[PDB]
Design a protein around this ligand. Structure first.
Ligand SMILES: CCCCCCCCCCCCCCCCCC(=O)OC[C@H](COP(=O)([O-])OCC(O)COP(=O)([O-])OC[C@@H](COC(=O)CCCCCCCCCCCCCCCCC)OC(=O)CCCCCCCCCCCCCCCCC)OC(=O)CCCCCCCCCCCCCCCCC
Ligand SMILES: CCCCCCCCCCCCCCCCCC(=O)OC[C@H](COP(=O)([O-])OCC[N+](C)(C)C)OC(=O)CCCCCCCCCCCCCCCCC
Ligand SMILES: CCCCCCCCCCCCCCCCCC(=O)OC[C@H](COP(=O)([O-])OCC[N+](C)(C)C)OC(=O)CCCCCCCCCCCCCCCCC
Ligand SMILES: CCCCCCCCCCCCCCCCCC(=O)OC[C@H](COP(=O)([O-])OCC[N+](C)(C)C)OC(=O)CCCCCCCCCCCCCCCCC
Ligand SMILES: CCCCCCCCCCCCCCCCCC(=O)OC[C@H](COP(=O)([O-])OCC[N+](C)(C)C)OC(=O)CCCCCCCCCCCCCCCCC
Ligand SMILES: CCCCCCCCCCCCCCCCCC(=O)OC[C@H](COP(=O)([O-])OCC[N+](C)(C)C)OC(=O)CCCCCCCCCCCCCCCCC
Ligand SMILES: CCCCCCCCCCCCCCCCCC(=O)OC[C@H](COP(=O)(O)OCCN)OC(=O)CCCCCCCCCCCCCCCCC
Ligand SMILES: CCCCCCCCCCCCCCCCCC(=O)OC[C@H](COP(=O)(O)OCCN)OC(=O)CCCCCCCCCCCCCCCCC
Ligand SMILES: CCCCCCCCCCCCCCCCCC(=O)OC[C@H](COP(=O)(O)OCCN)OC(=O)CCCCCCCCCCCCCCCCC
Ligand SMILES: CCCCCCCCCCCCCCCCCC(=O)OC[C@H](COP(=O)(O)OCCN)OC(=O)CCCCCCCCCCCCCCCCC
Ligand SMILES: CCCCCCCCCCCCCCCCCC(=O)OC[C@H](COP(=O)(O)OCCN)OC(=O)CCCCCCCCCCCCCCCCC
Lengths: 48, 56, 48, 115, 55, 35, 446, 106, 100, 341, 62
């Protein structure tokens, strides 16, 4: 029950929160680069 | 007791044969009996005065 | 050993639901031949 | 009436009497809220809860006045909304047609048997 | 018998609240009255304005 | 009313993050005046 | 009505006055007496005041709420002997009782939902404030997150019913009928968690144990009945789809009743065993609710009324051994017939009320519930006999092992029984035998 | 402590009831008032009120109307219990071409 | 009455509940007549109680015609739709018990 | 933040620039107002006593000028394609406009600057950042009619903003992650109404003022710092912490009302799956709200004993206790409100 | 025992005062044009007093 329940839900949410803190430990240039790619696919499709 | 629990094959066999299988067999039996009585009720094979549990 | 008698009276009441009044003495000599009253009699015989 | 006319549903006949609490609920609720806010301020500063009753009187008067003003504006807003709905029903008689009322006897639908 | 001290005089506040709630219920049953003696089960024949209301 | 929060309970809130990993265990807390 | 609501609203300033703990329960029993007086109710809604009205189901549930809260102030003298926050405790109890009265006397589905999910915050406050365990955080979070996770999509279902129908009133929504799976799951599963299932129960035995005595009364007395009241209001317009999907819940509830009745034979806590005992009887309530008979609905209402008294009275009995023997363990609680012999009358009188008993309202609720479930299918006679046998197999175990045998060695000296405790367990059992007299009151809400 | 101390107990050595553990005055007042608001109000006077409660449900009226109806129905002799909710001539059933393929439930 | 009106639905539901309680008392008094026949004619209950038992069985049959299989939530419209479907099934399939 | 009158000048010019942004009838005057708002929000978010505030202002500058130039480039591209400011059939240039607005607002594909900047600020510039600086981009998002970008942003905001706040024990990053989740409820309201968004934004702003005033007067920046906070009566600390339960969306307090109006309007607009995706991902927000509420819901704690006096501002805490009362007793004012309709 | 006797004694005084000195009503046919009140529809004097002075009528709630 706690597996497929509250304890394993808390463990999976703690693991998902721990693995998302590694996304936020990077420099600003990586996230701005991700925005620049999202502009880049949005302009490639404007050609097509 | 959750801290010493791991999803092994023995635990899966115990949780299947202890809980889920009697629930599944009982639900299948209840659905089969109610469908067999309900098709006889909806078809019209039983009389009005000869039906069990009239709540009378 | 008497709780099984309690649940047998409970099921006997649940099958005397068919004839309504649980005063069985007015329906004994009439419905001695019915399957529902045979179920009632089997449950109350198991109870005794 | 034997017709389900959309214009008479929004038209106020005047048979609806307002309740006793309807004109007076918002000023007394906002006055009690102002008195409780002054009591909350006096509790947060570790003052006595009924010390400085001028703040309680001013907060209650501000609450009563604001509740009466915004209740009158609320009533004018609902009157304008009702006028908008009646005007759009009157302007478009094709999209909202009078619909004949149907007795239960004409309809035949779905008893759900429990058994 | 029952024992009530000087602190039992503080119990007039819930009785005042009970009186306020009873007055609001009386106002609610005073308002809710367009079907009074006009329903088809507890109805009254012609001349209902001369007779007293039932409730 | 018999158990109250011990310093063992507030030990888990004293880190730089709530759930430490092998990367964030070597981190330090920010200054308590936030400057 | 508005008299009871304004009575509690003007009983709110009683908490802020010092040395005013015992007057509030006096006025609560007085308003319970006044609510005993106002009993002119029939199956339709009466005493219509704005959005507040009352029918017979709502009358019985508000009267049970008032009795449970009035005894809840009587049971908690440990809050009064210590300098634990009596004003906050009284304010939380009055606010929670007011929310229960407001969610039971609700004319519509939405106000019922609003005060229904307002009620879980004072229960949260009692569990995390006045309990005596390190796992109160595990207790309240399980309760709040279970009920909130399954009750948030019920709000989407409620406004889908409002958009399809137009109204929020129970009677106008009784006319309509829906043929959707997801609307049925939304409007049912929140109550299916709020009353204990087998699969979704977890919040119950881990929230009854770590709470206070007052959390135990408010959880096993009236907040396992919010889901029953909600299903009694929702099932009327979802009959076709619940007739398609009710065999799964009835089979799960019956097998789970047998299995949880097998759990209580392997339980070493007094307060946990009554917590699992609430699962078994409400399993019979859930199995009799979905058959939609007259007898199933009437016996479900009777068994919820007769269970909210007896489970709370059993939870007061486990508290008066926890206050003296120092632990809730079943090994420690042994031979209390030689320690408190006058209490053993109330132990067996409230443990017999948990099973079928001769004068109690629980038997009249259990008889009218087994009628509908045996009428539903003949295969249920195999597992109703097992469940109703195992119910007294486990319920006699708690009285037998706690109240008979050799004494636990190495127990220190504690106080004797008190008149307040005898009065507290008097009012949990004499309503159970005085309500078979005028039982057409507390059964025929239809 | 000696023999004459136990033979005549001191009035200051008082055993409390369950309500208060600080002074004897608050025990007696709360005990008598709590026994007043539960026993002789909610259990005796309330039960006397519920004994002579009127027909809120119409069960007594149902029995009287059933006796009068069984007096008048067997005098007419048409039916002791009517099987039909309305008259079979008053109800306008739809035709077979009107229904088509609709689920008729019995 | 019409579908949009809820005044008629409350009144017809209330008279359906009242007629249900009256017909329940009809069946109860007709059962008590058979019980008093069984007690008063103690050895010879086989012969004399037969018209009363036939009348009671006809009462149970007619009660199950009108209020049978309606459930706990039996509105006045639910019995009317059950009567509509019962009369349609009697028209096209004959009496119930020998239907196709 | 009132150490100088020049900061009051910067506050009124950032108010003026935001009002120029939200009232511009063209896509270029909105950019003009965005640059005015940026110029007046660079000196706030910068101070001499805090070292991290200068690099946080550098992060804010690079994030906003990256977003503003893409907003200008796509608006000029829209004007080059069709010379009116509106667009008949929606295309990729509106997608570039909306993505440049989402970098300004802080939606979850572009939100990674937001708590990383929030880790080194004060509690008043944070109050300006999550409340007033969300006015200028979100009021321009309402002019576009593409659905799937808003759908992806709402879904990603309510999962990423709720899960990512669990690991954070700093109060500023936790409030930033909570504002990211409350951002997604605002964009979900923007697809169905332009008034329900104002309802949710005004009361979310109200909850932001009353909750960030608790951490600004008493100078709280940590979860462990809440346990050592000394209040003279523990009932007052228990009562003051009900704003977390209020902002989490619990029915007796205020803050249930705007979320409930969003639920009412979304179900009436036949959008059920996205509502379920948000409300299964708002329980985590109440979980890290209740993790804050560990420090007040219990009635006794193992306090540090060197501090025995509670020190506080007078005017700010006088303004605080008015708004704390309406944060928990504000559902009585639903009868007076008429702006839902 | 004290607090059940203090309840029973005024209750039993009221019960013998109602049955002996007032007494229950006699059943009779309704006269034409009477239009009887709600408290006329019960037999016992305590039930009549409760239905007249305390409890609301069925017609009012209906
Ligand atoms: C209903 C709730 C109550 C009932 C369920 C309770 C919990 C039950 C858990 C359980 O049974 O787990 C079994 C099982 C346990 O596996 P295990 O043996 O412990 O682990 C072995 C592997 O590591 C397992 O591999 P893995 O799980 O790491 O690989 C897949 C993983 C890969 O991802 C990762 O590893 C982490 C990635 C970053 C996570 C944080 C950012 C997420 C951003 C959102 C992305 C999707 C957005 C949606 C789409 C947007 C565009 C349209 O991706 C996901 O799990 C996607 C989760 C997306 C977030 C959902 C949040 C709740 C929304 C409501 O887990 C699964 O089967 C995983 C599937 C998801 C289960 C539920 C998770 C809830 C949180
Ligand atoms: C665990 C949750 C309950 C599972 C059992 C209840 C259920 O779903 O019954 C539906 C059905 C009941 O079966 P049924 O009655 O629908 O099957 C009818 C089959 N025919 C048509 C051939 C006659 O459950 C199953 O079929 C599967 C049961 C569970 C299997 C294992 C699940 C592990 C998780
Ligand atoms: C809705 C409620 C309607 C209430 C209508 C009656 C209100 C009467 C208020 C005045 C009398 C109160 C009784 C009394 O002695 O008060 C002294 C008490 C105690 O005064 P005190 O002088 O002992 O102060 C305590 C000491 N400090 C300040 C350090 C904490 O004061 C109050 O009760 C003032 C608050 C009034 C609260 C009114 C009820 C609503 C509460 C809602 C909570 C949710
Ligand atoms: C800061 C508070 C702001 C309040 C709302 C102001 C109006 C905003 C708005 O857009 O209005 C138009 C909207 C909608 O109206 P509208 O959209 O029709 O108006 C547009 C036309 N104009 C602007 C020209 C009039 O109205 C509201 O929002 C009114 C809601 C109620 C406002 C009052 C709430 C508080 C009530 C009293 C609280 C307690 C007082 C006592 C204690 C005091 C303690 C200090
Ligand atoms: C499962 C969760 C995802 C469901 C997604 C589909 C919902 C949908 O769109 O329904 C539309 C359908 C049909 O809606 P409709 O009838 O308005 O259709 C109108 C037609 N369109 C949409 C084209 C304009 O809704 C229903 O059938 C009624 C239910 C409405 C509320 C739906 C809530 C979704 C959540 C379900 C949760 C169930 C379990 C709850 C307990 C456990 C929680 C974890
Ligand atoms: C939830 C609980 C809330 C508190 C409840 C407190 C107890 C209230 C009990 C009220 C019912 C009651 O006692 O009714 C009296 C009942 C009411 O019944 P009655 O006298 O009206 O009889 C007609 C009612 N039926 C059809 C059900 C029989 O009084 C009696 O039955 C009189 C004889 C009592 C038996 C002897 C008792 C000891 C002397
Ligand atoms: C099948 C139904 C399952 C329902 C699960 C409901 C969530 C729940 O109960 O979570 C409990 C959990 C707190 O668990 P806790 O006791 O604090 O953990 C001890 C250390 N492992 O609390 C949490 O995990 C908080 C977050 C819950 C998120 C729910 C929605 C997820 C999507
Ligand atoms: C280069 C190789 C990869 C190309 C991937 C192209 C994905 C987008 C395809 C497309 O046409 O997306 C547009 C579409 C919305 O457009 P449409 O639905 O046609 O009309 C508007 C009315 N809904 O749909 C959308 O705008 C929604 C998003 C579509 C999928 C986005 C894929 C993102 C790819 C990775 C980006 C990572 C971050 C940088
Ligand atoms: C909890 C304990 C019980 C658990 C198990 C319960 C099992 C119930 C099985 C019966 C119901 C399902 C099967 C029948 C379906 C409907 C068909 C039907 O009506 O069959 C009746 C059957 C055939 O007889 P028929 O000719 O139709 O008419 C009867 C009189 N002539 O009529 C007969 O066969 C007559 C006898 C019927 C069964 C009576 C006994 C049932 C109980 C048996 C166990 C207890 C016995 C006593 C204790 C012994 C062990 C200690
Ligand atoms: C909703 C949830 C409850 C909100 C209010 C919580 C009040 C808790 C309470 O009962 O506090 C009692 C307390 C006793 O005083 P205490 O703080 O212990 O003094 C220590 C001195 N060093 O403090 C007091 O007695 C003084 C503070 C009383 C505050 C009363 C607020 C009244 C609000 C009235 C309007 C309510 C809304 C109407 C719309
Ligand atoms: C928490 C607990 C939640 C439980 C939720 C249960 C939801 C599933 C319900 C299943 C169900 O009722 O299935 C009925 C269906 C047969 O229905 P029916 O249409 O009558 O059959 C057609 C006959 N020709 O039967 C089926 O469709 C069979 C279902 C098989 C499921 C297999 C699962 C394997 C794992």
């Amino acid at each position: 029950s706690e597996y497929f329940g509250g304890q394993h839900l808390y463990q999976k949410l703690s693991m998902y929160s721990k693995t998302l803190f590694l996304m936020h430990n990077n420099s600003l240039k990586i996230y701005l680069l991700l925005f620049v790619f999202w502009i880049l696919i949005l302009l490639i499709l404007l050609f097509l | 007791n959750y801290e010493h629990f791991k999803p092994t094959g023995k635990s899966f066999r115990t949780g299947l044969f202890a809980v889920v299988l009697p629930i599944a067999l009982y639900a299948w039996a209840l659905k089969a009996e109610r469908d067999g009585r309900e098709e006889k009720y909806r078809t019209g094979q039983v009389a009005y005065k000869d039906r069990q549990f009239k709540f009378i | 050993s008497n709780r099984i008698g309690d649940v047998a009276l409970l099921l006997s009441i649940a099958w005397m639901l068919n004839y309504g009044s649980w005063n069985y003495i007015f329906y004994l000599e009439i419905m001695q031949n019915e399957f529902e009253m045979l179920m009632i009699g089997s449950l109350v015989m198991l109870a005794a | 009436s034997a017709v389900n006319d959309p214009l008479e549903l929004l038209t106020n006949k005047g048979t609806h009497e307002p309740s006793f609490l309807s004109p007076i609920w918002n000023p007394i609720a906002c006055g009690v809220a102002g008195v409780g806010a002054a009591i909350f301020i006096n509790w947060g500063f570790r003052k006595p809860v009924f010390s400085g009753i001028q703040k309680h009187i001013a907060f209650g008067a501000i609450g009563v006045g604001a509740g009466a003003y915004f209740d009158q504006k609320r009533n004018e807003y609902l009157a304008k909304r009702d006028a908008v709905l009646r005007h759009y029903i009157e302007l478009h008689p094709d999209d909202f047609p009078v619909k004949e009322r149907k007795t239960y006897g004409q309809v035949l639908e779905s008893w759900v048997p429990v058994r | 018998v029952l024992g009530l001290d000087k602190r039992a005089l503080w119990g007039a506040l819930p009785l005042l609240g009970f009186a306020i709630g009873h007055f609001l219920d009386k106002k609610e049953t005073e308002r809710m009255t367009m079907f009074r003696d006009k329903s088809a089960l507890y109805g009254r024949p012609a001349g209902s304005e001369g007779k007293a209301p039932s409730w | 009313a018999k158990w109250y929060p011990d310093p063992e309970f507030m030990k888990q809130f004293s880190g730089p993050v709530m759930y430490p990993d092998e990367v964030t265990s070597l981190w330090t807390v920010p200054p308590w005046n936030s400057k | 009505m508005l008299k009871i609501i304004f009575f509690l609203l003007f009983l709110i300033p009683f908490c802020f006055i010092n040395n005013m703990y015992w007057m509030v329960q006096i006025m609560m029993f007085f308003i319970s007496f006044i609510f005993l007086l106002m009993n002119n109710f029939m199956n339709y809604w009466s005493e219509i005041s704005y959005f507040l009205g009352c029918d017979m189901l709502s009358y019985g549930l508000i009267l049970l709420s008032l009795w449970i809260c009035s005894l809840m102030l009587l049971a908690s003298e440990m809050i009064n002997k210590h300098n634990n926050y009596k004003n906050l405790f009284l304010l939380n109890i009055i606010i929670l009782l007011l929310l229960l009265i407001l969610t039971f006397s609700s004319m519509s589905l939405f106000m019922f939902y609003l005060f229904f999910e307002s009620s879980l915050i004072p229960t949260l406050f009692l569990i995390l404030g006045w309990g005596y365990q390190p796992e109160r955080l595990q207790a309240g979070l399980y309760l709040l997150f279970y009920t909130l996770l399954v009750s948030l999509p019920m709000l989407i279902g409620i406004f889908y019913v409002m958009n399809k129908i137009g109204s929020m009133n129970f009677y106008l929504m009784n006319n309509f009928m829906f043929n959707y799976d997801l609307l049925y799951f939304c409007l049912l599963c929140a109550f299916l968690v709020k009353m204990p299932m087998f699969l979704v129960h977890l919040w119950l035995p881990k929230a009854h144990v770590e709470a206070p005595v007052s959390g135990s009364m408010i959880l096993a007395g009236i907040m396992l009945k919010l889901g029953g009241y909600g299903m009694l209001r929702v099932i009327s317009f979802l009959q076709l789809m619940n007739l398609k999907y009710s065999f799964v819940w009835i089979s799960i509830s019956l097998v789970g009743g047998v299995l949880v009745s097998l759990v209580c034979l392997r339980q070493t806590d007094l307060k946990a065993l009554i917590a699992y005992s609430s699962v078994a009887h409400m399993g019979i309530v859930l199995s009799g609710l979905l058959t939609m008979t007259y007898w199933g609905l009437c016996g479900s209402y009777t068994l919820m009324i007769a269970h909210g008294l007896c489970s709370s009275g059993l939870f007061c009995l486990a508290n008066v051994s926890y206050e003296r023997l120092g632990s809730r363990s079943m090994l420690i609680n042994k031979g209390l017939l030689n320690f408190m012999p006058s209490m053993t009358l109330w132990w067996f009188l409230l443990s017999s009320a948990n099973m079928a008993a001769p004068p109690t309202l629980n038997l009249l609720g259990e008889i009218s519930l087994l009628n509908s479930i045996v009428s539903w299918s003949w295969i249920s006679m195999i597992l109703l006999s097992f469940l109703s046998f195992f119910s007294a197999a486990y319920t006699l175990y708690l009285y037998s092992f706690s109240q008979h045998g050799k004494l636990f060695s190495g127990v220190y000296s504690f106080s004797s029984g008190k008149i307040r405790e005898y009065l507290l367990m008097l009012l949990h059992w004499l309503p159970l035998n005085l309500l078979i007299l005028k039982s057409e009151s507390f059964m025929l809400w239809l | 402590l000696t023999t004459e101390d136990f033979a005549n107990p001191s009035p200051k050595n008082w055993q409390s009831y369950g309500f208060d553990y600080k002074d004897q005055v608050e025990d007696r007042k709360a005990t008598k008032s709590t026994f007043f608001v539960t026993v002789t109000l909610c259990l005796v006077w309330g039960s006397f009120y519920w004994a002579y409660l009127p027909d809120t449900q119409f069960r007594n009226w149902a029995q009287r109307e059933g006796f009068l109806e069984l007096r008048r129905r067997e005098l007419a002799g048409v039916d002791l219990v009517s099987p039909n909710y309305v008259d079979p001539a008053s109800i306008t059933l739809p035709s077979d071409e009107d229904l088509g393929d609709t689920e008729i439930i019995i | 009455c019409y579908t949009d009106d809820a005044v008629c639905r409350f009144e017809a539901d209330q008279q359906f509940r009242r007629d249900r309680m009256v017909d329940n008392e009809i069946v109860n008094i007709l059962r008590q007549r058979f019980e008093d026949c069984t007690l008063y004619e103690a050895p010879d209950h086989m012969v004399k109680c037969r018209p009363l038992m036939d009348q009671y069985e006809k009462a149970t049959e007619n009660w199950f015609i009108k209020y049978g299989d309606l459930g706990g939530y039996a509105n006045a419209k639910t019995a009317y739709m059950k009567q509509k479907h019962r009369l349609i099934w009697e028209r096209r399939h004959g009496p119930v018990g020998s239907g196709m | 933040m009132f150490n100088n009158s020049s900061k009051i000048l910067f506050i009124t010019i950032m108010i003026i620039g935001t009002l120029i942004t939200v009232t511009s009838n063209s896509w270029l005057g909105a950019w003009m107002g965005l640059e005015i708002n940026l110029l007046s929000f660079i000196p706030l978010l910068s101070d001499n006593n805090n070292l991290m505030s200068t690099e946080a202002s550098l992060k804010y500058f690079l994030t906003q000028v990256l977003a503003s130039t893409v907003l200008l480039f796509s608006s000029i591209l829209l004007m080059l394609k069709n010379n009116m400011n509106n667009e008949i059939n929606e295309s990729f240039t509106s997608m570039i406009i909306m993505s440049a607005l989402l970098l300004k607002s802080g939606a979850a594909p572009f939100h990674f600057w937001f708590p990383n900047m929030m880790e080194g600020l004060t509690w008043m510039n944070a109050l300006m950042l999550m409340t007033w600086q969300k006015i200028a981009p979100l009021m321009l998002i309402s002019y576009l009619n593409i659905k799937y970008l808003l759908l992806i942003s709402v879904i990603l905001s309510v999962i990423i903003g709720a899960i990512g706040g669990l690991n954070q024990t700093s109060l500023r990053k936790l409030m930033a992650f909570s504002s990211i989740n409350h951002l997604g409820w605002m964009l979900s309201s923007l697809m169905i109404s332009e008034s329900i968004w104002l309802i949710y934004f005004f009361f979310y702003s109200f909850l932001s003022f009353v909750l960030t005033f608790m951490f600004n007067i008493f100078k709280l920046f940590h979860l462990n710092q809440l346990f050592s906070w000394f209040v003279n009566s523990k009932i007052l600390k228990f009562t003051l912490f009900m704003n977390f339960l209020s902002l989490g969306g619990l029915p007796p307090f205020l803050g249930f009302l705007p979320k409930w109006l969003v639920i009412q309007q979304l179900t009436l607009c036949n959008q059920y799956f996205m509502l379920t995706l948000m409300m299964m991902s708002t329980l985590i927000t109440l979980f890290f709200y209740l993790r804050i509420c560990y420090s007040a819901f219990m009635m006794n704690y193992f306090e540090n004993n060197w501090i025995m006096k509670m020190n506080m501002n007078s005017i700010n805490y006088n303004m605080y206790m008015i708004m704390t009362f309406f944060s928990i007793f504000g559902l009585f004012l639903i009868s007076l409100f008429y702006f839902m309709f | 025992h004290f607090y059940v006797m203090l309840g029973v004694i005024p209750v039993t005084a009221l019960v013998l005062y109602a049955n002996i000195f007032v007494g229950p009503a006699q059943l009779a046919e309704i006269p034409e044009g009477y239009e009887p009140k709600h408290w006329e529809y019960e037999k016992h004097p305590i039930s009549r007093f409760i239905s007249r002075y305390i409890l609301n009528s069925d017609q009012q709630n209906y």
